[PDB]
Every structure is written in structure tokens, then in C-alpha cells.
Design a binder for this molecule. Structure first.
Ligand code: CDL
Ligand code: UQ
Ligand code: PEE
Ligand code: PEE
Ligand code: PEE
Lengths: 318, 71
């Protein structure tokens, strides 16, 4: 019966990823004065299925100079971690209830960078190596700031339990208390998901395809699925963190609908951002994260430590 | 005896054609934006202060229930 819950979490996520791609293409098209997929199925609704079927019936290539074990392992790790990050999210009840769910997401997101690193290095090609090193630089840029932002926001929650965030935001959204932290968190989530304007690891215009340039067919499909699942997961995490839906214990699907709508809004905002800005330079991304975000984040961490004591507003939990 | 017919501009001329850059201001002042931001922050701080004090009281009540049940 827990296996059924696992499947009911895994299969819909993959379906949403598949259709996210269609949504992504259509939104970009209409923002570019065109239509996007509207032939393969009514309103392009069968286009993701055709893409999935085409990719998995195409020949997978194993490069001659590549390291076989890491080359095959990296996409498996990417997709498995992308699926695993969903289990502690309360919608409004988590599949897995952790005392420290936030730390769990932090650690697993930190371990998801190795799929790009091992993939790029094991491809044994120059563009893949450049993509992997760009991933190293990206993580060095965003990690500390993201962690300190998370700590500063959760100081008003009282714990690292994700469900408690629903109780914290029963009357007001946390974005009205920490909007300066919310903006930096949103930018850091763009940087963490390798999304425009921070898509340096792929860098199509600069690096052809980046870390996955040598991947074809099914493994490439899994890398794409992992990336889009990460998009949806991170936006759901942001919606839980800063826009708390009201929960009725006898009426939980109201919370589920509200949370899904907020997550879709944030994902559509991601797609909107991709269509509006030029790409950063990765040294410029590091300088942005270390010279602007880091000092403000440190100051706001001090402020959000002092404020609950200042006003006698410390949250309940130990 | 047909007269000459050729693609020509209309008598007089064509209407004027704009070419100068047109980028309006379309914004508020910095003071106003900062004021709205700080006002939102203060309202949020007040609401969370009340909610967290109530939460502390509720936790004390729960702990008292546990204490009464412990023996
Ligand atoms: C106790 C001992 C443990 C025994 C391990 C199993 C038996 C060893 C042989 C199989 C492993 C590699 C397969 C292989 O070499 O076939 C090549 C084979 C033919 O090779 P080839 O083309 O003729 O020539 C290749 C060249 O020789 C050159 O090719 P190459 O350079 O790529 O060869 C390198 C490869 C060759 O193998 C070796 O060199 C010797 C094997 C020693 C490996 C042990 C190192 C210790 C690492 C840590 C311990 C891990 C746990 C082990 C204990 C498990 C117990 C339950 O060594 C490895 O890379 C091993 C990496 C596997 C580790 C997986 C860990 C996942 C990390 C994810 C993140 C962590 C999450 C948090 C925790 O290629 C294929 O068949 C295609 C796919 C093969 C790989 C598929 C995925 C890997 C298999 C699962 C590994 C274990 C995962 C669990
Ligand atoms: C500016 O131009 C560009 C675009 O604009 C037109 C793009 O879209 C774009 C992105 C590439 C697109 C063409 C999207 C391609 C869509 C995927 C690669 C297909 C992957 C979809 C599947 C593999 C997901 C799984 C499908 C199943 C049905 C899920 C169910 C799983 C079972 C177990 C159940 C790029 C790179 C681009 O450069
Ligand atoms: C039905 C056929 C079943 C055959 C099974 C054989 C398995 C195998 O190794 O075959 C190698 C096979 C095919 O190679 P070819 O010889 O070129 O093509 C043959 C077709 N003419 O290569 C592969 O696809 C490798 C498959 C991967 C092995 C599956 C298990 C991988 C385990 C990964 C563990 C690491 C996980 C890391 C993430 C965990 C972190 C939380
Ligand atoms: C990779 C590392 C995976 C990390 C797993 C973290 C899971 C987690 O945090 O949940 C903790 C969870 C609940 O604890 P709390 O909710 O915090 O408090 C108890 C009150 N209910 O505790 C557990 O259930 C722990 C169970 C054992 C942990 C599993 C360890 C698995 C490690 C990897 C093994 C896989 C094979 C090893 C080789 C892999 C690559 C070849
Ligand atoms: C009573 C006291 C209480 C506490 C006081 C708090 C007051 C705070 C007042 C200031 C808060 C501002 C927070 C903003 C933090 C970063 C701003 C910043 O300065 O960064 C910019 C740059 O930041 C960016 O512009 C990022 C670019 C990437 C843009 C990507 C998309 C744009 C964002 C879309 C909307 C985001 C919506 C976020 C909320 C979503 C919901 C969570 C610096 O870059 P440069 O211009 O190059 O200057 C440095 C070199 N001279």
C-alpha cells in the first residue's frame, strides 16, 4: 500500500514533466509571436508522447573515448535523485515525514550536481568538460547563499519540518515577512536548476550542448526529464516556503488545488523569464552571488536572528 | 492617346513616418517603492508576532497535557 503511494507520486510527476515541455514550447512560441506545437494531437497534446517514443527508439551512442561506467551511471543518478526530491513535500501530507526535510532537500540537491560532473568528465570530450567545470563554478557561486537564505527564512518556522510551514503561514504568507529574502531565493533557484539566464552547463550558443553533448536517445531523455522535474520540484518548494495555502484537515484537496496552482504559476514565471533575458557569464554569476547576494544575505541573517528575540516572537518548537 | 500611368507617390505626399526612439518613463519613484516595501515588512512582522505568541501558548497547553498524563 506504500508501494502504491510511491507509484502514485512517481508516475504523475513524469506525466507533468512530459507536458511541461509542451507547455514550455507553446508559451515560448506565443511570446515569440508564433504558435508552437499544434499539429501532433489537438493543440499539440500528443507531442510529448511522440518525443518520448522517438527518443527511446533511437540508437544510444557510447563514445569510443568515454568511461563506460560513469557515462551510464550519471543519467540514472540524475533521474533517481529528481524523483526522490518529491517524497518529503507536504501536499498537504508528505509521503515521507522527516524532522529535517529541508536539510534532506539541501543534501540531495547538493548530490545532484555530480550527474552533470560525472557525465561531463566521462564523456571525454572538450565541450563536455567545459560544461562540467561550469557546473562546478555554478555550485560554488550559489550554495552558501542558498543555505543561509533557507536558514534565515526558517528561523520564523521554528524547525526544519516542511509540514510546519503550513502552520506558520496560516494567516499570512511568509513573502510579506521576507520578500527581500524571497527574491534572492528565487534567483538562487534559477541558478540551482541551470535555467536561463543561468544555463551555463549546457550553454547551447556557446558550448553546442555542454555536459550532455555526447548523450543521445534515452539517456539524453532522462537528463531532460530530471531537469524539468527539478524545475517543478523547486517551484513547489518555493510555493510551500513563501506562499502558504490554507489547510483544512477534513478538506485536504482544497490545499492540494491551491498548492498546485501556485506551483504552476511559479513554473510559468520560470518559462516567462527564459524568454526575456540574455545569458549571464559564469564569472559574472559568481560575482553576482558573492558580492551582492552574500553580504545582503549575511545582514538579513543577523536581522532575522535578532528580530524574533527583539519582539518576543520565537516559534514554538524546540 | 493614353496618358502615362506609373507607380508614384500620391499628390502632395505620404504621411509622416516616425523614426525617433520612444522609450517612456512608466514608473514610480524610488522613495515610494521603498516605502511600500518597508510597510509590507512591518505588517508581516506584526502579524507573525501575534501568531507566534499564540503558538507559544498552544505549545504550553500541549506540554501541560503531557505533564498531566505522565505519571
Ligand atoms: C566489493 C566490490 C564491489 C564490486 C562492484 C561490482 C563488480 C565490479 C564490476 C562491475 C562494475 C562496473 C561495470 C563494468 O566495468 O563493465 C564494463 C562493461 C564493458 O566494459 P568495456 O567496454 O569492455 O571496457 C571498459 C574499460 O575496461 C574501462 O571502462 P571504465 O573506465 O569505465 O571502468 C571503470 C569501472 C570498472 O570497474 C572497476 O574498475 C573495478 C570495480 C570496483 C568498484 C568498487 C569501488 C568502490 C566505490 C565505492 C563502493 C560502492 C559500493 C560497493 C558495495 C556494494 C555491495 C552491495 O569502475 C567503476 O567506475 C565503478 C563505479 C561503480 C560505483 C557506483 C557508485 C554510484 C555512486 C552514486 C552516488 C552515491 C550516492 C550516495 C551513497 O560495460 C558495460 O557492460 C556497459 C555498462 C557497464 C556499467 C553499468 C553501471 C555500473 C554497474 C553497477 C556498479 C555498482 C553500482 C551499485
Ligand atoms: C530556442 O529553441 C529551442 C526550443 O524552442 C523550440 C526548445 O524547446 C528546446 C528544448 C527541446 C524541446 C524540443 C523539448 C523536447 C522535449 C523532450 C526532449 C522529450 C522528453 C519527454 C519524455 C522523455 C518524458 C517522459 C514521457 C512519458 C510519457 C512520461 C511517462 C513515463 C512512464 C514511466 C509512465 C531547445 C533546447 C531549444 O533550443
Ligand atoms: C532484455 C535484455 C536484458 C539484458 C541485460 C544485460 C545488462 C547489460 O549490462 O547489458 C549491457 C547493456 C547493453 O550494451 P550493448 O552490448 O552495447 O547492447 C546490447 C544490445 N545488442 O548496456 C547497458 O545498457 C547498461 C545498463 C545499466 C545497468 C543497469 C543497472 C545500473 C545500476 C546503477 C547503480 C548506480 C545508481 C546511482 C544512483 C543511486 C544514488 C541514490
Ligand atoms: C544517500 C544517503 C541517503 C540519505 C537518507 C536520508 C533519509 C532521512 O533523512 O530520513 C530519516 C529517517 C527518519 O528520521 P527522522 O524523521 O529525522 O526522525 C525519526 C522520527 N520519525 O530515518 C531513517 O529512516 C533512516 C533509515 C536508514 C537510512 C538509509 C541509508 C541508505 C544509504 C545508501 C544505501 C544504498 C546502497 C549504498 C551504495 C549506493 C551507491 C553504490
Ligand atoms: C526595518 C528593517 C527591516 C529589514 C530591511 C530590509 C530592506 C531591504 C531593502 C533592499 C532589498 C533588495 C533585495 C534585492 C537583493 C538583490 C538586489 C541586487 O542588488 O542585485 C543586483 C542584480 O540582481 C539581479 O538583477 C538579478 C538578475 C537576474 C534576473 C532574473 C529574473 C528577474 C527576477 C524576476 C522576478 C523575481 C520574483 C521573485 C519573487 C518570486 C516569489 C518567491 C545587483 O547586480 P548589479 O546591478 O550588477 O550591481 C552590482 C554591481 N555594481
Amino acid at each position: 500500500m506504500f508501494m502504491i503511494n510511491i507509484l502514485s507520486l512517481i508516475i504523475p510527476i513524469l506525466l507533468a514533466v512530459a507536458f511541461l515541455t509542451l507547455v514550455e514550447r507553446k508559451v515560448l512560441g506565443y511570446m515569440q509571436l508564433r504558435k508552437g506545437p499544434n499539429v501532433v494531437g489537438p493543440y499539440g497534446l500528443l507531442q510529448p508522447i511522440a518525443d518520448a517514443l522517438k527518443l527511446f527508439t533511437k540508437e544510444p551512442l557510447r563514445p569510443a573515448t568515454s568511461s563506460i561506467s560513469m557515462f551510464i551511471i550519471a543519467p540514472i543518478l540524475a533521474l533517481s535523485l529528481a524523483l526522490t526530491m518529491w517524497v518529503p513535500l507536504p501536499m498537504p501530507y508528505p509521503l515521507i515525514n522527516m524532522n529535517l526535510g529541508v536539510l534532506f532537500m539541501l543534501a540531495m540537491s547538493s548530490l545532484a550536481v555530480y550527474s552533470i560532473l560525472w557525465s561531463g568528465w566521462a564523456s571525454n570530450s572538450k565541450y563536455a568538460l567545459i560544461g562540467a567545470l561550469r557546473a562546478v563554478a555554478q555550485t560554488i557561486s550559489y550554495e552558501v547563499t542558498l543555505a543561509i537564505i533557507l536558514l534565515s527564512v526558517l528561523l520564523m518556522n521554528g524547525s526544519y519540518t516542511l509540514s510546519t510551514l503550513i502552520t506558520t503561514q496560516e494567516h499570512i504568507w511568509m513573502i510579506f515577512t521576507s520578500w527581500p529574502l524571497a527574491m534572492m531565493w528565487f534567483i538562487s533557484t534559477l541558478a540551482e536548476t541551470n535555467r536561463a539566464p543561468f544555463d551555463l552547463t549546457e550553454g547551447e550558443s556557446e558550448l553546442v550542448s555542454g555536459f550532455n553533448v555526447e548523450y543521445a536517445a534515452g539517456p539524453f531523455a532522462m537528463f531532460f526529464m530530471a531537469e524539468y522535474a527539478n524545475i517543478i520540484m523547486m517551484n513547489a518548494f518555493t510555493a510551500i516556503l513563501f506562499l502558504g495555502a490554507s489547510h483544512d484537515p477534513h478538506t485536504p484537496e482544497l490545499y492540494t488545488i491551491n498548492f498546485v496552482l501556485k506551483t504552476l504559476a511559479l513554473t510559468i514565471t520560470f518559462l516567462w523569464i527564459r524568454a526575456s533575458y540574455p545569458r549571464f557569464r559564469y564569472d559574472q554569476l559568481m560575482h553576482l552571488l558573492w558580492k551582492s547576494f552574500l553580504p545582503l544575505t549575511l545582514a538579513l541573517c543577523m536581522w532575522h536572528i535578532s528580530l524574533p528575540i527583539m519582539t518576543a516572537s520565537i516559534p514554538p518548537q524546540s | 492617346a493614353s496618358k502615362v500611368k506609373q507607380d508614384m507617390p500620391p499628390p502632395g505626399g505620404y504621411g509622416p513616418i516616425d523614426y525617433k526612439r520612444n522609450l517612456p518613463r512608466r514608473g514610480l519613484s524610488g522613495y515610494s517603492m521603498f516605502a511600500v516595501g518597508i510597510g509590507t515588512l512591518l505588517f508581516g512582522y506584526w502579524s507573525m508576532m501575534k501568531w507566534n505568541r499564540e503558538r507559544r501558548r498552544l505549545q504550553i497547553e500541549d506540554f501541560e497535557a503531557r505533564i498531566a498524563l505522565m505519571p
